[PDB]
Design a protein around this nucleic acid. Sequence first.
DNA 1: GTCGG
DNA 2: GCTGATGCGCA
DNA 3: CCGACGGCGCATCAGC
Length: 333
Amino acid sequence: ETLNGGITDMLTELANFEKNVSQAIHKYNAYRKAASVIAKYPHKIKSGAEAKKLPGVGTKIAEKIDEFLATGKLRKLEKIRQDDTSSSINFLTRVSGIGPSAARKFVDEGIKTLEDLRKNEDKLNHHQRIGLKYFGDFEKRIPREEMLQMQDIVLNEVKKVDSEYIATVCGSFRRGAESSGDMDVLLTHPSFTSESTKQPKLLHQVVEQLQKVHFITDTLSKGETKFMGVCQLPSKNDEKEYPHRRIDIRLIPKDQYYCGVLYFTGSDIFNKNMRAHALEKGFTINEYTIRPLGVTGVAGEPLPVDSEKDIFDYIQWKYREPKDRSEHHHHHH
DNA sequence: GTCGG
DNA sequence: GCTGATGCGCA
DNA sequence: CCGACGGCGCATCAGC
Ligand SMILES: [Cl-]
Ligand SMILES: [Cl-]
Ligand SMILES: [Cl-]
Ligand SMILES: [Cl-]
Ligand SMILES: [Cl-]
Ligand SMILES: [Cl-]
Ligand SMILES: [Mn+2]
Ligand SMILES: [Mn+2]
Ligand SMILES: [Mn+2]
Ligand SMILES: [Mn+2]
Ligand SMILES: [Mn+2]
Ligand SMILES: [Mn+2]
Ligand code: NA
Ligand code: NA
Ligand code: NA
Ligand code: NA
Ligand code: NA
Ligand code: NA
Ligand code: NA
Ligand code: NA
Ligand code: NA
């Protein structure tokens, strides 16, 4: 059904192998870039030559594409798939808090499976233990209807703490997706601007409230502006429990809301491409500001921004609505 | 790994 | 304490 | 051993 589905799944697999096993992050990013441009390509790829025309596809992927098209597989990937060490390493990184270095360490110590990992809980830090505890639940996606209930709860409780907070659910949700990986909330409040923090514990108060009402159930990491943890909807009387979910909360200066909401709306790929296009135009964008780079590549003063579109205009891109910042694929008959 | 020098 | 490096996470 | 590739928050360590 997915047009060029075979190719893009191959490149995604290779990407995960480079990131997770090889610890080669640039090759990860190359394979990701290549799989992104191919999936958005509206034609059937017939040869490596044709793929090579696209930006991000060079000689080695085209070569891989030629092989895949001829044989229906890739020998490199078949060998990786056979390697139990490479497989277990790859698998352990799916646990939140376990990245490529801790996975490799664990596998070399004989920790190869989910069952093994539970038995070695005392090797795990808190982040990892919570990721393990909820590993099955965090695999599941969240239907938009549950996203709306999660929204209702978050916005009710923020308003209880202080009616001047504004919470905005970003991520896939803001891009209109029918299901989401997790819930990403952007928080602002007038006391926190880029120039001053006139109130203390602005993020901590909201988090405390969300735990007090037993929405937030666990914490992975927590600072002054970013919270990362776990939440769960209330189940009704006698109906089964809802799964636990990942929730991110990011407090952003009130005067930089637009760079903020652009960042937290994503997608990640869109952001990396948008920020890459800024660089070639002579700007640098982060979640706070868009700045010009001087002759030496040092950023200068923030430019004024009164809307998301102002950011796109500075870098000569047509505005793209949030729905159009998601990745997309094409189909065949 | 791909691109821009 | 500061800084800066590594590891992990976010979009 | 051509070097850039988006950019940053939190956690933890090392060297000063
Ligand atoms: Cl690399
Ligand atoms: Cl294969
Ligand atoms: Cl894009
Ligand atoms: Cl900044
Ligand atoms: Cl997407
Ligand atoms: Cl890179
Ligand atoms: Mn489809
Ligand atoms: Mn397309
Ligand atoms: Mn998300
Ligand atoms: Mn998230
Ligand atoms: Mn303008
Ligand atoms: Mn994500
Ligand atoms: Na197909
Ligand atoms: Na190319
Ligand atoms: Na992980
Ligand atoms: Na509501
Ligand atoms: Na903490
Ligand atoms: Na659960
Ligand atoms: Na561009
Ligand atoms: Na204005
Ligand atoms: Na990066």
